[PDB]
Symmetry: C4
Subunit: 344 residues, 4 copies
């Protein structure tokens, strides 16, 4: 077997050491724009998020209202694919035709929206999603280091060329990244065993996963001239974990629990002895996938807007402490230290 | 004294990083066959388990019903030797004559069964066990790095040559493995201070023990052409620990607590305030060895079959995530990372 | 991004290994004097504390009574600047005119006192503080690696030259130290995420911060001939942490919680079911800064004098165990070992 | 300051890996004899304990009955010196004249006994102790790396030459050992911050302390031909810690809590709601030193004999697992591994 020189680590094991903060770095001047899909050196991504946050491909988080609410703030949602092709396409269509400063929209001023797909019924689901107006797709899987994903991306390329964007994942190392990059993925999702590994035994600390995949992505860019955006998926407990994920190289972040707490999540608001909660279950739980996970409750946080703006104001503030006015500048200037077990 | 460069680790400190999963790796195509006794390069083992699980040499787990139930699933039990020679031989005989797709049987279609022996009364116990039809024997001891075991194996060779198979142990390092290999053991058992060390002070994290013994076993194979199967004994808390043990090099796994929970274990089923439990005590407890351990209760799990098949389906699934269709392929392709203290 | 070879550590992870204790090292012969402001090689600091303790720039700790009580023992307080320029100046004036063996005083026998300033209204606050008689100033900020601080120090130099002393901070690495040193700081404060980091994600274990800044300060001294005193600010839970901070290179220590417990702190004494407590809130809490922190209670300790003398007697005693009669000798002879996670 | 490459560790962080156990290593054949005082290469120590255990120099453990009871088993007690010279001498005399297979006695068949002394009134205490018949003395101090101890040993040599044996300590590193060795100590005691460091901040994990001091002691032996026995003092929680301490190089072990639990300890037996306890307080507690420590209760264990024999049977058993029939052989053959934080 193959072993590693160092153990893997989670976001909770890191802290950022401040860099020079210039008089021009104030939160309001921080640009949180970020590329969503791959492009060649020298060019810009065809799709850029206004904020580096995307909602998880889950029944309990990415519904119509979520997609609309997040797009309004500059991010994008990936309508869950764990439902009929007709239902998902309908949700996508509803978001695209809803309108009939930081909002994420297309050339027709319609909100952007994503849609998750699986490596099984894509020959029928994809066309339906494209026709419905889906701006981007993403293969939804825990272990994306699979030939099934290569086959799915290949089919999409054969039928649509590079006109249909498709993210792939999840992977946690350079080999997995490399495989999906060569297969043609527009963006690669990072993360196995991090979300809200102690059942199947597969996974890797999210921080180590991001750091290693990013190094491979950069190596890949230097070899091919192709920059593939990567997504840190899961493992984000606190707002500062967002800044860490971005500083370590992730272009954007996918979150489930974070968004499930909002009024716009498609789950029922339930009051548990004085506390308003919201339902939240994984796609691997028996409660789903029947149209690897648990079924629980998250504290109600109110509307997405206020929470997202508060979280991002914190990120912007921290970025200025690190002397960065943009995500790429943060990824370049960030000083990241591991913290001792005892300190935690 | 002799010290080591790194501290030892337990199974709980590791995770598997996925490898390429091909379209042909589906759980139903995973072969869990594994060698039980030593053979030379180029040949096959005279005895191959259908599944890599064997029940512990304990009064509270390996009785007749257990031996039969496990053999039916492809594994083998080692009837405890902590009883009279006549009683143990009778149990062995009963299993061999019980019948008067994955079942483990001999050329006469009789279920395979093992029997534990000690380094004291073997001159009388062994012949009785051989006559009773025992398919394989195993010296039952915590510290197998002993001249007493060399003497026992030597006596068996002198009287039966290589016609009677005998496992030895336990050891936790290359030196101990080497000593039992040269003594003639057919398979070497790994593990001291792991089962369900804080009393005598001897032992080693199971993971480190397996990894180090396996490296020595491989070195030994390259030097002599003799492949000696090794058994990871104890320290398995969760199903994924099985996959880890196998990925690290163990050919098969010995378990006590895991099997004690089943209806077929020879212990009394007791109800403790709404919970059906089963008795489970170590061979080192005063409750035994009078014909180093504790006496407790384990939650009732039902019949062996359903539990074993569920556990192995998980192992098979994980093996496919690692791109392996067989145990040897898993041992070759597995990517194993240590996890930080804080992550746990 | 930039990463580090080792994780950071806190004071709790260290212990001092005794050195040779000579017959002349008795507690009463230990000199705790220490430089407060920078000087060139070969000279003495214009301001030397009698004891290496200074009270934090906080509303809940450094008021008039505190400043007087601490100065009487040989230390100095930094009257909080989170109040009107007129109020702070009045407090400073009151301390300077209060008197109208180890007391810290000026040539006119008046108690020494410090005052915190911010990088915003200093053009008006500073002159008022100088006129009021403030002996030293200190820019109060969490992230002192800022151009705003360079600008503030520069303004002070342009108007007062080196006649007005001003400390700066906080920083946690060599780069931050270097930046404030070149900007002209008279002393640099160390510490971010240590006080009584899990919200913004910035910081560093106090021990690592002190050790690294001190090495840079020493390197800086060798290159320029300028010795800049450094202050370990926050992260001191137990008395022995003081000895550690000093042994690691800090010239003096800034504390908040420690002094807030005293009768002389400006907070209300409140009895909570049999226990007399005192209020203590951070400057980052909403409870302040409205003229990043929590609002709590600390156990009443009585008058500053008895507590400070008890704490320092312990430090002196430990210094003798290390064979040191002075802080510089301690910094030179101290043997400091990290302790394992498990030992704690 | 001086730092170290690795953090220090405690006994709880180690385990012994078995070595070859020969047919001749049975517990009853294990020799636990060990040297108490220094000798030159090629010779034997003038005083050899029958068992490697000595009771602590404490008011709550080493009284007359303890000294007699331990000597009967082969060990020796050090009558506490924290009492009047007349009282201590009387206790020593009482043990020497008490009798007016493994017992530790002199040429006149009288039980051996030790006595603690301080670096203050030794000019009067020592002569009284020698006249009373004390077989060995030991300077009782937490930080023995002191000129006061050198002065005390020097005075003893000047007046008695090498006819009066005196142990010194405590130290935790090679430098401290070296200093007391050159000063003339007959045996050096190891241990600061281990007994039943979080107050003064000085100390070192007991295991690291023993390992480092032993390496220096061996280096010293090779340079001078003088073998100085070392004593692991404190930090022993479980019986197996004894085996570890000996395996790491300690010739003998000093214990307080362990012996305080016995009927023969000089403390009052008190019943606390169904549990018979015994008082146990440190020499640094206010409860003493008035003729750094806590005052507590330890569970009653009964008479010393049965407990000591049970503890040593375990040590002997473990020694055989390591292939050792004697302590020196154990120190030579022991395989000691550090254990991960998580494993504990
Ligand atoms: N990130 C994690 O750690 C994690 C863990 C568990 C579950 N999940 C989530 O649960 C949901 C399902 O994930 P998943 O990976 O278990 O589902 P998946 O569809 O990606 O799983 C594919 C695996 O390959 C098999 N297979 C056999 N033939 C196949 C074919 N023709 N095409 C594709 N696969 C074939 C099975 O489908 C098996 O599920 C997702 O939302 C995923 O994110 C995530
Ligand atoms: N794996 C562990 O960590 C662990 C720990 C404690 C107990 N156990 C279990 O307890 C049971 C007993 O194990 P054990 O090792 O204590 O028993 P064992 O029979 O292997 O022990 C042999 C040891 O050598 C001695 N000895 C002296 N003469 C001997 C002779 N002629 N032949 C053999 N030994 C001689 C004693 O028997 C002593 O018990 C086993 O089932 C074992 O698995 C396991
Ligand atoms: N040490 C720590 O870890 C920590 C953490 C949080 C808060 N605090 C305390 O809270 C109090 C406030 O600290 P702070 O650093 O948040 O306040 P600060 O005044 O030092 O913060 C300056 C930051 O730059 C911005 N800025 C924009 N224009 C500016 C200008 N012209 N001049 C200066 N800054 C400008 C904002 O003021 C922003 O607060 C202090 O007492 C500080 O010690 C300490
Ligand atoms: N091992 C530990 O970690 C630890 C910690 C605290 C206390 N203790 C115990 O408490 C008891 C007292 O230990 P201690 O070291 O505090 O006492 P000690 O007598 O060894 O201490 C000597 C120190 O030097 C000073 N000194 C000044 N003049 C002196 C002189 N002329 N001679 C000697 N010392 C002079 C003081 O006495 C001061 O106590 C002992 O039993 C000791 O084992 C042990
Ligand atoms: O172990 C898992 N069991 C599940 O049932 C499950 N469902 C989703 N996911 C994955 O978790 C991400 C969301 O994580 P957070 O809630 O931590 O943001 C998601 O974006 C997915 O990557 C699962 N992981
Ligand atoms: O410390 C011990 N004290 C005992 O009394 C004892 N009895 C058995 N064994 C050993 O433990 C293995 C079973 O472990 P699990 O329950 O963890 O599967 C078994 O297979 C044995 O190796 C003991 N170990
Ligand atoms: O995280 C923080 N939030 C706050 O609100 C805050 N207020 C003060 N400080 C800083 O803490 C130091 C005092 O710490 P102690 O109480 O630990 O001595 C002080 O000297 C400051 O450096 C803060 N840090
Ligand atoms: O920190 C301490 N405060 C005290 O008051 C104290 N009194 C004794 N000792 C030392 O501890 C040893 C006994 O330890 P155990 O109870 O762990 O065997 C003893 O042998 C001494 O080395 C003290 N250490
Ligand atoms: K900064
Ligand atoms: K895979
Ligand atoms: K000393
Ligand atoms: K052995």
């Amino acid at each position: 077997a193959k072993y590693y020189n160092e153990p893997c680590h989670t976001f909770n094991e890191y802290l950022l050491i401040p860099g020079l903060s210039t008089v021009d770095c104030i939160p309001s001047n921080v640009n949180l724009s970020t590329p969503l899909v791959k492009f060649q050196k020298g060019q810009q991504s065809e799709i850029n998020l206004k904020i580096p946050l995307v909602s998880a491909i889950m029944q309990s988080v990415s519904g119509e209202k979520m997609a609309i609410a997040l797009a309004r703030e500059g991010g994008i949602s990936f309508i869950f694919g764990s439902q009929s092709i007709e239902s998902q396409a309908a949700m996508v269509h509803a978001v695209k035709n809803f309108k009939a400063h930081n909002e994420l929209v297309d050339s027709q001023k319609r909100y952007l929206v994503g849609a998750g797909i699986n490596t099984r019924d894509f020959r029928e689901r994809v066309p339906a999603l494209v026709e419905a107006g889906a701006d981007v797709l993403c293969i939804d899987s825990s272990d994306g280091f699979s030939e099934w994903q290569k086959i799915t991306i290949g089919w999409i390329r054969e039928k649509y060329g590079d006109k249909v964007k498709v993210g792939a994942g999840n992977i946690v190392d350079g080999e997995g990244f490399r495989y999906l990059a060569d297969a043609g993925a527009d963006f690669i999702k990072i993360g196995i065993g991090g979300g809200s590994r102690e059942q199947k035994g597969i996974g890797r600390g999210q921080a180590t996963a991001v750091i290693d995949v990013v190094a491979e992505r950069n190596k890949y860019f230097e070899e091919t001239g192709i920059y593939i955006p990567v997504c840190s998926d899961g493992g984000i407990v606190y707002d500062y974990h967002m800044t860490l994920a971005l500083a370590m190289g992730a272009d954007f972040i996918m979150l489930g629990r974070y968004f499930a707490r909002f009024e716009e999540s498609p789950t029922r608001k339930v009051t548990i002895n004085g506390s308003v909660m919201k339902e939240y279950w994984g796609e691997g739980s028996s409660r789903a996938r029947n149209w690897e996970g648990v079924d629980s409750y998250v504290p109600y946080a109110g509307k997405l807007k206020d929470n997202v703006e508060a979280s991002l104001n914190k990120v912007k503030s921290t970025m200025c402490n690190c002397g960065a006015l943009t995500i790429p500048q943060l990824q370049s200037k960030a000083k990241i230290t591991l913290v001792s077990s005892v300190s935690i």
